[PDB]
Amino acid sequence: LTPLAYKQFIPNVAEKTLGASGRYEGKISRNSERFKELTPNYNPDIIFKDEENTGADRLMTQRCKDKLNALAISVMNQWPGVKLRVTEGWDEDGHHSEESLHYEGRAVDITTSDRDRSKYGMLARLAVEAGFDWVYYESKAHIHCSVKAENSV
Amino acid sequence: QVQLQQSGPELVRPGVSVKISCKGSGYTFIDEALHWVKQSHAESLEWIGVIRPYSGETNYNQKFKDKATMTVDISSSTAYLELARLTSEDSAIYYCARDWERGDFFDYWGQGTLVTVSSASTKGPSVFPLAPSSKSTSGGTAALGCLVKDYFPEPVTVSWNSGALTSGVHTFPAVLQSSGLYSLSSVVTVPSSSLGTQTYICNVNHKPSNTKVDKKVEPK
């Protein structure tokens, strides 16, 4: 298991391509019927930043939960005493790209709980192994992970 | 509402150290990294370093490694920057700025702290009224203001009516007098019709001399 390099993404294709996470289906807003498809992840082994104080970071698709929960296990196995951390889940802040998978609960930005940047390349490798459809070492401060839409699986 | 509030301007003698502060509010202070940035005019913005309150970790620009020390006081939500052994090169505006855990770039900035390195003594300003008169009227408007004379170092700040009056205010860049002291004026244009009912007070601050003065500007 080798860490991802800075700015590396796996698989080595664009996020929205068929081999990776696939196309953006459309923004999910709070006042929408599709908002009801999102449920909060309440995993005790995951830290949610929730700087918004809204619980938005917990909201994600079922497939996102499944891969994130597997990742929570491997993180603790890799570094005893450390946990998976989520800085961004579903987003309504507009704090991502124009057509971000965050806007429909298909992406998370993650760190370790100790916010040790030196662990993030390996964290990214763990996210690949946990089954995320696309993983990108997007900034010095976080790893972006995403999944296929529910109706693509 | 995220805010970073910095300490006031400083006059410091060459060879001495200065400690400037940055207090965070409107977010959980311990939770975000705080960076320091220098602004001159000739080398405009330069990153000094970052402190991470949550871990206590610091990273310095090698250019500032011998010069700067970053600390935090978590209980008071305040970060500190100490610059040692000051020279003329060190006169500048210093900002604190927060990152938002998306990389090393900055969503909220402090207002800046101006540091002037000089062996000269501080001098507080004299404040004189610029009264609205029959020689300061234009299309039914009157101009009035305050002359802020003979201070050192910069900055003087001026507000009108405790910040309640901002429209049509011009607070001019200071000029350097032959003495080496600064002077500035702050003016405002107002309706001529209400000179009898409205009150106009300039609030003048010069932190290095601990001057806080207020002057009511009346028709003469």
Added chain:
Amino acid sequence: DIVMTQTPKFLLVSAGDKVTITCKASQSVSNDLTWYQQKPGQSPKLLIYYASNRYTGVPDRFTGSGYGTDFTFTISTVQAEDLAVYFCQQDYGSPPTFGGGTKVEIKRTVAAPSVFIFPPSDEQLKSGTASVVCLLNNFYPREAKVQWKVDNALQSGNSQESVTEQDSKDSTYSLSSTLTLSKADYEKHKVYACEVTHQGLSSPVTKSFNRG
């Protein structure tokens, strides 16, 4: 360290025109490029990050593009309030480094100054000095001549002038000129005049007072 070379250094543009600023990195910075706007007497404000993402609240007229070494910041239709110095910053390499800035100044139609004159205060006179202030308010362009006359004699060497930054709402400038005399000299003369020449005036405007 990575050097960010920003061009041009200055742009003069009418409201409605396009603004194009270029930032070039000395080595690849991937997409780790941020653009900030710094309005007169303010701290920088974040506009674009990851080279092309608009930050929240940032108007559609502001965009960024580029990847690697070549980056472009565009204001599609510049507005009066966009007068500012714009900076790029990379954070790919350590330390983070900034470009040198581009000053965006606004071109507009000619505006004549409103001119006002202020005698010295009695309080100042008590202290032994007399400052006389001439105010030129909200004019365009910056080019303006102030001439002090005392009993019709042209003054030299006893005045200082200062011009404001450009106004973010009407794109004008203002200017203050102060004539400084000792109380003794001030009391030797009667007529104090400020004569203003500017493009927007048909002929020069004089504001004056008689001491007393």
